[PDB]
Amino acid sequence: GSIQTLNLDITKVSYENGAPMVTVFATNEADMPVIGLANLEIKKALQLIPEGATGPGNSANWQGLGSSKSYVDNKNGSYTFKFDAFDSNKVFNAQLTQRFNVVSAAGKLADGTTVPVAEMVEDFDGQGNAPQYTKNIVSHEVCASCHVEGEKIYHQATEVETCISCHTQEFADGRGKPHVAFSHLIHNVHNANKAWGKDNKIPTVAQNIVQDNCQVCHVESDMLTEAKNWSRIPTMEVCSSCHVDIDFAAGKGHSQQLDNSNCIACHNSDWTAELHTA
Ligand code: HEC
Ligand code: HEC
Ligand code: HEC
Ligand code: HEC
Ligand code: HEC
Ligand SMILES: [Mg+2]
């Protein structure tokens, strides 16, 4: 036997003991329960710092609250996670949107059934109900135009939301490498103005296919309410991924900007959208 698609749905989030308890339901392509998953995990628990809160003009960004591999198989298709060490930095804030990134590793069930990789994110408010605000800009579908589905893109994972959940601005800044925040990295790896990674790769191949065409990734969707952030939210952290010759701090290539407080006053969405579009 072999499962074609593994679907993961979060069916309940409850905060008791403070820490969240999260129930996941696993189904196959025929919507039948999948029991016995041995490699299910909450790869990341996050919360969403809203636009502005880290400073003026700044992007919303994801703050880390931990992860969990500790769960009970409820033997009907559902699995319930607990956290042994939730929010170790003690920043949990029930006012913020909360996200869980759930993944199941490819493998096999007790009876030898093969099961593929699965990944998802879902967002909630601070008590497990619907989220009041989101940062939904891009979804995986666009990457599947040019990257084989179900296979890792570069490393770690197969879907863009998983990448975004680990490659946070906090993660990048904590390691001393702002360029590894996903909103920087993704433009960098497809744009030839600057090399990337351990082999100092110049992305000529990506450049010639993507051609800085924002609309191959940034598309309108009812499911993605922040899709217009690509033109609405100019920051030095992101815009510099391709505009690599500006030094905002020293005023080289541009007037000095010591933060993102005023970018949008000049770089209005209409202008940014129009000038970057063929
Ligand atoms: C075609 C229009 C593309 C879309 C949409 C996306 N990517 Fe892409 N990517 C593309 C090419 C032609 C290449 C270069 C491959 C090469 O071997 O040189 C890439 C590269 C990446 C990489 C770097 C991998 C590498 O150079 O080793 C990553 C990490 C990457 N792409 C991720 C990615 C994601 C997450 C996308 C959706 C948001 C996405 N790409 C779209 C072509 C295209
Ligand atoms: C944490 C759980 C990760 C997930 C999920 C993904 N990545 Fe990752 N990535 C991670 C680390 C710790 C590092 C090293 C960063 C450093 O200190 O150097 C990386 C690195 C990359 C890179 C290289 C970036 C650069 O050097 O400029 C790329 C291109 C990259 N990661 C891409 C990527 C993609 C597309 C992901 C989803 C498919 C992905 N990463 C997930 C940690 C994690
Ligand atoms: C896929 C290869 C992409 C192309 C081409 C472009 N963008 Fe992009 N961008 C993409 C991703 C995966 C993300 C991260 C989304 C997340 O949730 O973190 C982004 C992000 C931006 C942002 C940041 C918005 C914010 O709220 O801070 C901006 C301003 C942005 N992208 C602009 C941009 C422009 C102008 C492009 C064409 C010149 C462009 N993007 C291409 C993926 C890709
Ligand atoms: C790579 C995917 C890019 C990202 C991310 C951003 N921009 Fe960009 N920009 C890009 C290209 C290829 C070009 C040249 C287009 C052309 O027709 O020559 C541009 C150009 C600009 C300009 C005009 C500059 C000029 O030389 O007259 C501006 C003002 C500009 N871009 C702004 C901008 C901002 C504010 C961004 C973050 C939201 C941003 N760019 C991202 C490629 C890329
Ligand atoms: C009005 C006082 C501005 C403020 C505040 C910011 N920018 Fe700007 N920027 C402005 C102009 C008039 C231009 C030149 C446009 C042209 O046609 O050449 C720019 C240029 C940029 C570019 C393009 C740089 C390049 O490679 O040519 C980018 C990416 C850019 N600006 C981004 C940006 C950001 C992120 C800001 C806040 C930190 C910002 N600018 C402030 C006008 C003004
Ligand atoms: Mg680059």
Residue numbers in the entry: 44 to 321
Relevant lines from the article:
All Shewanella capable of EET contain an mtr gene cluster that encodes for MtrCAB, a porin‐cytochrome complex that transports electrons across the outer membrane and reduces extracellular electron acceptors (Fredrickson et al., 2008). An outer membrane cytochrome (OMC) termed MtrC binds to the surface of MtrAB and can directly transfer electrons to extracellular terminal acceptors (Edwards et al., 2020; White et al., 2013). In both MtrC and OmcA, the first five hemes are located within domain II, and hemes 6–10 are within domain IV.
Site‐directed mutagenesis allowed the production of a truncated MtrC variant comprised solely of domains I and II (MtrCDI,II) that is near‐identical to domains I and II of the full‐length MtrC. Upon sample reduction, there was a shift in the Soret peak maximum from 410 to 420 nm and a sharpening of the α and β bands (maxima at 552 and 525 nm, respectively). These spectral features are typical of redox‐active, low‐spin, bis‐histidine coordinated c‐type hemes, and together with the LC–MS, indicate the protein consists of a soluble MtrC pentaheme cytochrome mainly truncated at amino acid residue 325. X‐ray crystallography was used to determine the molecular structure of MtrCDI,II,sol to a resolution of 1.8 Å. The structure confirmed the successful assembly of MtrCDI,II,sol, including the covalent attachment of five bis‐histidine coordinated c‐type hemes. The orientation of the 10 histidine imidazole rings that form the axial ligands to the heme irons is also highly conserved (RMSD of 0.225 Å), suggesting that the environment of the five hemes was unchanged. The redox potential window of MtrCDI,II,sol was similar to the observed window for MtrCsol measured under comparable conditions. Thus, there is no evidence that either the N‐ or the C‐terminal domain of the full‐length protein holds the majority of hemes with the more negative reduction potentials. The biophysical, structural, and spectroscopic evidence showed that the MtrCDI,II,sol pentaheme cytochrome was structurally homologous to the equivalent domains of MtrC. In our experiments, the addition of a stop codon to mtrC resulted in the assembly of a truncated MtrCDI,II variant, with domains I and II both structurally and spectroscopically identical to the corresponding domains of the full‐length protein. This MtrCDI,II could interact with MtrAB, resulting in the formation of a 15‐heme MtrCDI,IIAB nanowire capable of reducing a limited number of substrates, but unable to reduce the key physiological substrates FMN and Fe(III) citrate. The in vivo catalytic experiments presented here demonstrate that the reduction of physiological substrates requires the full 4‐domain structure of MtrC, yet reduction of certain other substrates is still achievable via the 2‐domain MtrC.
